[PDB]
């Protein structure tokens, strides 16, 4: 009694960093499947479509390139795509709420539903789809009872997270880790499974493959997430007992990731992790938690949340202490903004709420990083303050010697390569007297900035051994 | 200083025996000696029978007493002839005061300390190995230095060390930590133990940091592990009100590779000596130093162990009708984990203690607990009598879930799983419940037979 | 289910023999029996003198009994005969554990059911006629549906029975409540009871609904009765601070016939058996489905009732110099309200304690209630040392006014109105207090008289 048989014609709705890169990936290891990727951005889909995609991605051009018009598409005719697909995997935003019933922490699943709409409308025969981007648990349910209204047609939907990284995309989706599919507990929903295990296990060994139900892939995203983001916080909160005892967190952090049952990955103390995952999917979690009255999980979860802000916050505290707690018309010269080193992504930045804070103390601020735009920095600050507030206080340089240059302090909020090993004795010398260094990504040499003569501070570290 | 060959450790235990046996065995040329002033504890050292079973911890003994293993009940003569000494004494819990159920009674630390202090003779190096509050050392480097008013560095290398591994772990440990003072005298003597070490660990493995870092590192790993398991049980509670499960969901979790896979079983709570009291440990020093932010997140893993034990009792006595005075509830498992009959912190402990507030009657069987050891842990977080009124103990299961209501697994013992759970059913008082605090059984099996069953990260209704 | 025509009832107490007296009286080709443990009082039921007095019980009970009405110890036969059976059993309130001092405990409904269970043989219909929590039903059905692997089915028919009035509140009720299964076979059972009450109630009052509606209406019309005593009182606080009457407020309010002129008494505050443990029956139910503004909004009829209490003993306690150690205050009155020796949650009870803790002497006066009930009671909320200590019971007003500081009307009983209060005054101690908490004596009189007199729901200084 087969329903859904064997795929032969893909479509992802929504072509950006997971969409694309993944139906590549598809078409690249399937050259019997056609794929097609659709998006009502035309002119995003005419970058696909061009001699310059639109992201950069190592291994990705070899890919699409050798694939476009073979077995990979790029189209903006959305409705053509769903009626042809078997399988059809919706890759779009679900942004943060802004106002309402769960205001800054839950998912706004308004993409979902339209996608979910639209495949109601043009489907035409039975069809697979595919939960490709982080949904809140149970958005499944959602999508099941959009497509179910038009069943007056069988439709079987299915979660299969993504785990890709900006930069290692390709190596992501070719070795993964793992593959992680869930469905309903059913034989229709079985078999939908088996339809997308089939095509993974063209690259990806069986046993790499989990399968679970629905909810559980769907929490399981949120909580691999989650329980990232706790040991960044958790090594964080005690970077401050570090700078309080005499202990150092460098020290601390390396003899406790050796041991095999906690790992060594993740335990870099920062000012604060940022990007467009970990707080967004932490506080997903806790609005879900709050939603199934268990506010005790809820507490436990938020409070990763409220170690990342209070970093950020007292950080600057520091910076403003230490600077005679008056820093109006101040200069101040912030090394970083981007969330991480080798990125423009600007998303959850620690710096953007850093500058903030130093901002509310009217400080004047010339701002160096090496690869965000400035019309970007310059949008991000203002979304946070003002337009206004950015024209008054906000300086963006294209070097790091003229930030620097007449500034009490140098602030350094984003992990580069090339901040160490800058000429630190000119910076001195072209400062104002005493001399500040706040190191909020633990990358500076102590010894040699207190040598050259700066008051040095570094997360992680107490001021005075 | 002053290189070291001669070892001492004062304190006989779990922690002083086994590592000094490491040491002779892998250095013959140490003569390693380890005192204690309960001289049958000595006794036992020295005899046939050994005080603690460790698995290949006999043959290691027996090949190094008399040669270059000594047990001795002499402490003031072993502290006299010393290089190097361990100090491996408990650190009780306050049970009273500044820091009550939080903060580490300091006073045997303090006691041997002084010891040394009196009978010392020369310079030594003072090694803390037992679990210690951050700073400690501080206080030993002070009591000692009323006696050179003799040449003291006092060092830090903390165990790491379960029990039943603890010989495979000494001879092959994860990493050798330890921290000095951050001066030509203590790198001296951090090199000095290094070296012993070095006789058979890969100095890859071995991490030298300040005192403070390796006091904190101990307690701050502890702390990891414990929140590992609190985070995975905090979210066994979001399967069970959504209909994901929690098997489901560590096992995905877990083949990320920076997270791992060890340490995400989800259970009634973790138990055992080191991890609550390290936590509290962590949660009180971060309270001393004003803190409060840190303090509270770390609580919050301690909080989440307490809430899944009283859940968990909360769901069996609502099941049962919200009354369970003078009701039969049979508790398959009371040590803290499986394969031991080591109680301390157990769950069991806990649950079973929830359920005398209700005035539950409790028949209790664990395949290795000592009877009077589960009478007396009960006894002493409740009543004598208290548990004379409402605890049976049973040495056969089948007569714990004869007539009762409910049967609850609070340790994870293979032999829980495949009773004749048919049998049990229909010996049992109907409707018949089952609850399942370690996820062994299988749900499905159970509810054939009739069962109203219930797992931890699994929702009642499919 | 066949017509009836063998009614059981499981409990002989105010609630099951009045009701099956009735059900007997009306209904001459049903045979009824009442049954219960307490073999010595089914004696009293055979007796010549019935174990509890109401007006026109007698003449119903004395007519029936041995014909169509009969009361045994023997409940195993009575359940294997019965067509219906009502539970009438006490659910007294959780002492410890989950819901103390809150949820009703349902033991003695489970011990029922699992007889009813064991001894049943053919089809019952099984009806909650005491006072249960919500879903008290569902646990019942379990117990019922573990016998028939026999045919059963449980009704809702809530007791709206008081004190002095069982007679008539039976004959004449406002209404008839029965709640069933929303099913074939529950529609059938709720028919069968509906016949059984259609031989005296006319249809037009009985009021025929889902098991859970019915079990939460009894709770809730209670919740509203004493919602509208705490509101009223409330209020009283109002007109003692601005110059109005409560009296004259109550008076102008009632007038408004959407709100009814009944239960609008001021007084020290509500008692009985009913009040105190539905409202907090139905808090704890608020709390256990997550609606915990629900739940506040109810627990305020309480913490006004309480309030109440507190405030009127703390004016006795203001009035005499705040200190009344070793000092005499007489008590007039001790039962819950007038007419009848109930002290279950007296107002009178409370107040007393809260005398008592200052170390006040107080000899209580009630015409009714018994020296050793009043002893008993008072030592369940101190101690029999407390109250051997501070407390003397007088058979006469004038004796425990003698001598005293204040006089403290407690009980509405109306030979307090018209007792010799000149005479009273020239015997006390002066400056003379009077503190009325029933709103029953003439504050000009008293006034004139030369006390300094109070009332609830009066300003003071007029």
């Known amino acids: ?10 479509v992802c709705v929504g072509a ?32 696909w479509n061009s001699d310059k995609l639109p992201i950069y991605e190592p291994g990705l051009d070899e890919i699409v390139f050798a694939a476009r018009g073979r077995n990979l598409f790029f189209s903006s005719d959305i409705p053509k795509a769903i009626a042809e697909a078997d399988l059809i995997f919706i890759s779009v935003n679900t942004p943060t709420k802004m106002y309402g019933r769960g205001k800054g922490m839950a998912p706004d699943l308004k993409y979902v539903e339209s996608v979910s709409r639209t495949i109601a409308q043009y489907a035409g025969g039975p069809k697979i789809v595919v939960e490709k981007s982080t949904v809140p648990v149970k958005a499944a349910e959602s999508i099941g009872c959009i497509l179910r209204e038009a069943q007056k047609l069988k439709f079987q939907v299915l ?19 793992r593959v992680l599919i869930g469905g309903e507990s059913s034989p229709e929903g079985l078999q939908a499974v088996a339809e997308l295990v ?23 995203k949120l909580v691999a997430n989650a329980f990232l983001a706790q ?65 005790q999980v809820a507490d436990y979860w938020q409070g990763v949340i409220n170690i990342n802000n209070w970093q950020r916050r007292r950080f600057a505290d520091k910076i403003i202490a230490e600077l005679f707690n008056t ?8 090394f970083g903004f981007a969330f991480k080193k080798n990125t423009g992504d600007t ?24 690869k965000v735009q400035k019309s970007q920095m310059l949008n991000d600050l203002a979304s946070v303050t003002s337009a206004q507030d950015v024209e ?29 090993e800058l000429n630190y004795s000119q910076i001195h010398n072209d400062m104002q007297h005493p001399a500040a260094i706040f190191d909020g990504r633990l990358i500076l040499d102590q010894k040699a900035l207190r040598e050259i003569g700066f008051r040095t501070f570094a997360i992680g570290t107490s001021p005075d051994q």
């Open 347 to 370: 998303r959850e930045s620690s710096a953007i709420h850093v500058i903030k804070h130093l901002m509310e103390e009217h400080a004047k601020l010339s701002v160096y990083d090496p």
């Open 327 to 334: 820093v109006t018309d101040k200069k101040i010269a912030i």
């Open 392 to 420: 008054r206080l906000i300086t963006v340089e294209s070097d790091p010697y003229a930030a620097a240059r007449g500034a009490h302090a140098i602030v350094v909020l984003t992990e580069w390569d090339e901040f160490v």
């Open 198 to 220: 089939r095509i993974y296990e063209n690259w990806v060994p069986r046993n790499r493959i989990i399968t679970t139900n629905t909810w559980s892939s769907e929490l399981s």
């Open 231 to 295: 040991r960044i916080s958790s090594i964080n909160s005690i970077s401050a007992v570090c700078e309080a005892t005499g202990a150092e967190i460098s020290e601390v952090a390396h003899a406790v990731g050796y041991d095999t049952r906690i790992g060594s990955k993740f335990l870099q103390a920062s000012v604060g992790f940022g990007g467009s995952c970990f707080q967004k999917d932490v506080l997903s979690l806790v609005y879900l938690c709050e939603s199934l009255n268990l506010p």
């Open 159 to 177: 979660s299969n997270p993504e785990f890709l990284a900006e930069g290692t995309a390709m190596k992501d989706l070719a070795n993964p880790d």
């Open 1 to 10: 009694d087969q329903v859904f048989g064997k795929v032969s014609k893909v």
């Open 16 to 47: 950006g960093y997971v969409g694309g890169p993944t139906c590549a990936m598809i078409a690249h290891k399937c050259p019997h499947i056609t794929v097609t990727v659709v998006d009502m951005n035309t002119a995003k889909i005419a970058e």
